[PDB]
């Protein structure tokens, strides 16, 4: 393989999603399940609009991506 580049990544910084290993709680949602390793974040758009993106956990570690707050982790760190 290696040819096949159709692959899901982060939407916002272009990077893969290579870190998801953590295990949320209180969440139970599903918008069409979990993708792997990648969370669909719902951000705002400075156009005046609401958008679900792919993001990757460094993009949502790191924050400084355009947000609308769309973690509600019970857990600082």
């Known amino acids: 393989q290696g040819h096949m580049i159709m692959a899901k990544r982060c939407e916002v910084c272009g990077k893969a999603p290579r870190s998801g290993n953590t295990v949320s ?10 993708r792997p390793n990648l969370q669909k974040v719902r951000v705002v758009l ?6 679900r993106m792919r993001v990757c ?11 609308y707050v769309g973690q509600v982790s019970e857990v600082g760190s």
């Open 57 to 67: 956990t460094s993009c949502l570690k790191s924050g400084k991506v355009k947000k």
């Open 46 to 51: 400075p156009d005046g609009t609401i958008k």
């Open 25 to 34: 709680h209180s969440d139970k949602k599903s918008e069409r399940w979990f």
